[PDB]
Amino acid sequence: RVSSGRDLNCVPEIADTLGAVAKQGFDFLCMPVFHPRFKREFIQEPAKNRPGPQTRSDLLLSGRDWNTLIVGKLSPWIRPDSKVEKIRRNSEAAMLQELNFGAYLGLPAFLLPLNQEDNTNLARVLTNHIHTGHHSSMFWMRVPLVAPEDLRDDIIENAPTTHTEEYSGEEKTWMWWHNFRTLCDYSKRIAVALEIGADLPSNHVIDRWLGEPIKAAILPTSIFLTNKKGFPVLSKMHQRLIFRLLKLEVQFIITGTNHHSEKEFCSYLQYLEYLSQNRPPPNAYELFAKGYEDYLQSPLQPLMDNLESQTYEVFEKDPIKYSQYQQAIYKCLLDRVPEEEKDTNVQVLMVLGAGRGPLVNASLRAAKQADRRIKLYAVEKNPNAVVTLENWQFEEWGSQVTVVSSDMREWVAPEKADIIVSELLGSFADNELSPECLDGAQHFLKDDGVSIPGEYTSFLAPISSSKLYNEVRACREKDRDPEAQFEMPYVVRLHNFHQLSAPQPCFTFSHPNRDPMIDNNRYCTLEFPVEVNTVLHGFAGYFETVLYQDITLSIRPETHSPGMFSWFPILFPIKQPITVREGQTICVRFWRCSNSKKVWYEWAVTAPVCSAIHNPTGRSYTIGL
Amino acid sequence: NLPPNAPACMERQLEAARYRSDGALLLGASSLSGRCWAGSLWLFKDPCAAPNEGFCSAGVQTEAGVADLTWVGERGILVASDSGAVELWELDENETLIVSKFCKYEHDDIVSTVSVLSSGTQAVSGSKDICIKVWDLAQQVVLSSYRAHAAQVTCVAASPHKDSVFLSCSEDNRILLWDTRCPKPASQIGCSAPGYLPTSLAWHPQQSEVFVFGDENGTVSLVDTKSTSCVLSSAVHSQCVTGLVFSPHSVPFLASLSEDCSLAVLDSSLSELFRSQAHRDFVRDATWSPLNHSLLTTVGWDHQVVHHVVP
Ligand SMILES: Cc1ncnc2c1ccn2[C@@H]1O[C@@H]2[C@@H](Oc3ccc4cc(Br)c(N)nc4c3)CC[C@]2(O)[C@H]1O
Numbered sequence: 001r002v003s004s005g006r007d008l009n010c011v012p013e014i015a016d017t018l019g020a021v022a023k024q025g026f027d028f029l030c031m032p033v034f035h036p037r038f039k040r041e042f043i044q045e046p047a048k049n050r051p052g053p054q055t056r057s058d059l060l061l062s063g064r065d066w067n068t069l070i071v072g073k074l075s076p077w078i079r080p081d082s083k084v085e086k087i088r089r090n091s092e093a094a095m096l097q098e099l100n101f102g103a104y105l106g107l108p109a110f111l112l113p114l115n116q117e118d119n120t121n122l123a124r125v126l127t128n129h130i131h132t133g134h135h136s137s138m139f140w141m142r143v144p145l146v147a148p149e150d151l152r153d154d155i156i157e158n159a160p161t162t163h164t165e166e167y168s169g170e171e172k173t174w175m176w177w178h179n180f181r182t183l184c185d186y187s188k189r190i191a192v193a194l195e196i197g198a199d200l201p202s203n204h205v206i207d208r209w210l211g212e213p214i215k216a217a218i219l220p221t222s223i224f225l226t227n228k229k230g231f232p233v234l235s236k237m238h239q240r241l242i243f244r245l246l247k248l249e250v251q252f253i254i255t256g257t258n259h260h261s262e263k264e265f266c267s268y269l270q271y272l273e274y275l276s277q278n279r280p281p282p283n284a285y286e287l288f289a290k291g292y293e294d295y296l297q298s299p300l301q302p303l304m305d306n307l308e309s310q311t312y313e314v315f316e317k318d319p320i321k322y323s324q325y326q327q328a329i330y331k332c333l334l335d336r337v338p339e340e341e342k343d344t345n346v347q348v349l350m351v352l353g354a355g356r357g358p359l360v361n362a363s364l365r366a367a368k369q370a371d372r373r374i375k376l377y378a379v380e381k382n383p384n385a386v387v388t389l390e391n392w393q394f395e396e397w398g399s400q401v402t403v404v405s406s407d408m409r410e411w412v413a414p415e416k417a418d419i420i421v422s423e424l425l426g427s428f429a430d431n432e433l434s435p436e437c438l439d440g441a442q443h444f445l446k447d448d449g450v451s452i453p454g455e456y457t458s459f460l461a462p463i464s465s466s467k468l469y470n471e472v473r474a475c476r477e478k479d480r481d482p483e484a485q486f487e488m489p490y491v492v493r494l495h496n497f498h499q500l501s502a503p504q505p506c507f508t509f510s511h512p513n514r515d516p517m518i519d520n521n522r523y524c525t526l527e528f529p530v531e532v533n534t535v536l537h538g539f540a541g542y543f544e545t546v547l548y549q550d551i552t553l554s555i556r557p558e559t560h561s562p563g564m565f566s567w568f569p570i571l572f573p574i575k576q577p578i579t580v581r582e583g584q585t586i587c588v589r590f591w592r593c594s595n596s597k598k599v600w601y602e603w604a605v606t607a608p609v610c611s612a613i614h615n616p617t618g619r620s621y622t623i624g625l
Numbered sequence: 626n627l628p629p630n631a632p633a634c635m636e637r638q639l640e641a642a643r644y645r646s647d648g649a650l651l652l653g654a655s656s657l658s659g660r661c662w663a664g665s666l667w668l669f670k671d672p673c674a675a676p677n678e679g680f681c682s683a684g685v686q687t688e689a690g691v692a693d694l695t696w697v698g699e700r701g702i703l704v705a706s707d708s709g710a711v712e713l714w715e716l717d718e719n720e721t722l723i724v725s726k727f728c729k730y731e732h733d734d735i736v737s738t739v740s741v742l743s744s745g746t747q748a749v750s751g752s753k754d755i756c757i758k759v760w761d762l763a764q765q766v767v768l769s770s771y772r773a774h775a776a777q778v779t780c781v782a783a784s785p786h787k788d789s790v791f792l793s794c795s796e797d798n799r800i801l802l803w804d805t806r807c808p809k810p811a812s813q814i815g816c817s818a819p820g821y822l823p824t825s826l827a828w829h830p831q832q833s834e835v836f837v838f839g840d841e842n843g844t845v846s847l848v849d850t851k852s853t854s855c856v857l858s859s860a861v862h863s864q865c866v867t868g869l870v871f872s873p874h875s876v877p878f879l880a881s882l883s884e885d886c887s888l889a890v891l892d893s894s895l896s897e898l899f900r901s902q903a904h905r906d907f908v909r910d911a912t913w914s915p916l917n918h919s920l921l922t923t924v925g926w927d928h929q930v931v932h933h934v935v936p
Binding site for chain 1: 659663730771772775776777801810821841
């Protein structure tokens with residue numbers, strides 16, 4: 001299922017050309033809206049008074065066709081950054097005319113090239129068009145992986161091609177894009193149409209496009225190799241990039257004439273459909289996460305707020321998570337009570353934050369496996385979840401389980417526990433306040449008692465994602481700090497991003513907390529080596545937890561628990577993007593702060609440059625105690 | 626009376642005007658606006674009856690527009706098309722029809738410039754796809770393909786008497802001297818200063834190591850390939866120099882085409898002798914009469930075929 005388009009710069013009859021590309025199987029068509037050679041004058045007479053029409057009529061297609069099948073293209077003679085003033089003034093007038101016409105037609109996308117370093121005036125004129133009205137139309141900046149100057153044949157005897165490695169120079173077209181979208185102030189309407197050449201650049205040059213809003217990939221017919229039967233095909237390296245772009249769900253565009261003339265134009269299409277059908281299928285996690293890609297969510301605050309029914313339902317449909325919890329209990333029971341005591345000793349187990357009872361059931365299953373005697377207390381503060389627990393206790397569990405409707409920090413337990421079990425962990429481990437909860441409860445755990453989980457560690461990693469930076473920027477709410485959306489974390493399935501350095505551990509908590517003076521506050525400095533040129537947009541947060549001994553759960557990509565889809569990564573953004581060069585170190589500082597009523601995080605980048613301290617005093621984000 | 630196969634009307638945008646050795650005018654026209662964006666080829670054995678369709682010797686329509694044209698001998702017509710094809714059309718045995726010889730889609734974008742090489746067996750083309758292709762007219766194939774430029778190819782001009790030599794100029798600011806005999810065929814030439822983009826080229830018809838070029842600012846420059854640093858230059862036009870054509874004279878005159886809607890006629894020192902504001906739109910070609918050397922014909926986007934009497 002590849003959505004594809006045909007790029008044409010020659011359309012004699014619009015209807016016949018449209019029907020032609022349709023028969024060939026193309027979903028849309030990129031075409032000129034004014035004749036590409038029809039240079040127009042706006043200042044100088046007599047050419048200014050040229051009789052009309054200036055182009056073909058809108059009546060030639062239905063409104064629907066214009067909205068869905070046509071991608072406009074700027075005329076190649078429009079040069080807003082030309083050194084000739086007369087050309088600069090005229091191209092500004094022509095650029096506006098063409099863009100206004102495409103907006104008049106209701107075109108879904110419109111293409112403009114970035115075929116040189118300086119596009120300041122092209123940016124001034126486009127930005128101006130965006131701020132003239134309020135529309136949904138996209139602008140696809142046609143930009144190549146390799147600039148033409150860097151891919152030209154070595155055939156100029158007195159002007160030869162440089163055979164030296166220029167790490168930064170090979171990434172010149174990315175800088176063209178970067179500068180153009182910076183000038184246009186990261187408009188959500190401006191995206192990349194990435195043109196792939198016959199020869200691929202170094203992987204660093206390709207990786208430089210990670211986290212960028214790529215909406216289209218342009219494949220010229222020329223890059224296609226010929227197979228033994230005469231069919232157009234691609235090199236193993238070109239396939240790698242195609243597969244990468246398929247994940248980003250870009251629209252593929254075929255540009256150029258048919259060079260495999262024995263076959264039809266649908267042969268270029270058939271190859272892409274074949275490549276699309278022959279990729280690894282969506283695995284349990286990738287199938288689950290589908291739809292949530294780069295979708296920002298507020299992290300849950302299950303202590304302050306009572307969770308909804310369908311939320312516990314989602315938590316529950318994660319077999320791996322509770323399989324591991326079962327195994328951690330099963331292991332702890334054998335270690336605590338020997339086979340000789342298998343009928344004398346009854347273990348007091350306390351599920352702290354029982355929800356709808358998945359850990360109460362997992363404890364029962366662990367006992368009917370370890371063949372040991374257990375007493376259960378199912379503590380839950382959410383009275384709505386307690387209704388589920390008490391209807392469970394009556395109809396199944398019986399007197400074996402004591403349902404407690406209380407806050408675990410307030411509860412006066414009749415006896416002590418051998419094991420306190422809980423699932424109070426967030427995507428950043430301690431973000432749902434697992435430390436504070438378990439500290440208020442550890443008074444009713446036996447002097448030799450076990451906590452499942454016994455330990456948890458959060459991890460941070462610097463990331464680049466212009467898509468997620470803009471996604472956050474758009475989270476501006478009235479009646480609050482206009483910059484507040486940057487001073488809060490988000491639970492998101494990070495998809496279009498680039499991990500700038502390996503995750504490093506951030507905050508660690510251990511239960512029981514045997515410390516004489518318990519302090520859950522933290523200050524931590526991380527130094528991240530970056531071996532690429534990039535733009536820092538924020539930090540991806542993850543976690544790892546020891547439930548019991550070797551039985552663990554992890555969302556850190558290097559050690560991610562297989563098939564476990566409960567927690568998505570967390571994101572700590574920064575207000576202003578930070579330029580990072582190859583070889584530099586990203587230094588971040590994170591604090592975990594609290595008072596008697598609330599807990600929060602503060603953060604700051606101190607290298608290569610400083611950021612402001614994010615979330616001072618919990619002004620934008622706090623977690624209620 | 627309109628000939629058989631010839632279209633009822635001619636497309637407004639007149640692109641090319643080429644006098645044959647016998648005095649018969651060849652026309653190239655494109656439909657650049659309106660519903661259909663195609664082109665056509667015309668022959669006027671009576672040049673004073675053009676652009677009137679019903680008073681032509683031959684006429685045909687092309688699939689797409691006509692960006693450039695050139696006479697391949699006395700019966701052949703080589704066309705640079707928007708389709709990406711370089712087309713060869715041949716005159717009828719009676720010279721009453723214009724029949725398709727070949728239509729090869731080799732370029733990935735609009736073909737904008739064509740020049741047939743001194744022999745007449747080969748030709749060179751320049752496209753917006755940044756390529757330059759050397760063609761075998763007889764074999765109907767591309768012999769060589771050169772990606773020397775970094776932006777679209779604006780002009781390609783074959784040497785008057787060398788089948789290996791030809792000039793090219795692009796929006797990448799390079800003027801390239803080509804010699805297919807050299808292992809690296811192109812060589813970057815021109816004045817010391819980079820200046821403004823080159824738009825048009827014209828070899829000298831007598832001095833085989835001299836040519837002229839027009840820039841995007843209206844400047845016409847006199848260049849020696851040898852001294853490879855220009856001496857003479859005249860700001861002939863207020864806008865882009867579209868074309869440069871040399872008169873058939875032993876001491877040739879230089880016709881200057883422009884987007885400023887004017888025509889100028891210059892001498893050996895690039896001085897103005899004539900000027901015509903006759904056109905109301907862009908001047909797209911110039912062709913000196915073979916029969917009357919002091920007669921010069923121009924076409925424009927205003928659908929005019931003006932015949933100038935050059936003093
Ligand atoms: C002081 C106190 N006393 C008694 N109960 C308490 C408290 C503090 C919290 N709770 C209870 O703990 C339960 C918590 O269970 C879960 C279950 C699954 C999760 C999955 C993910 Br993904 C995730 N991010 N977090 C999860 C949290 C949240 C929902 C819950 O039922 C609260 O009411």
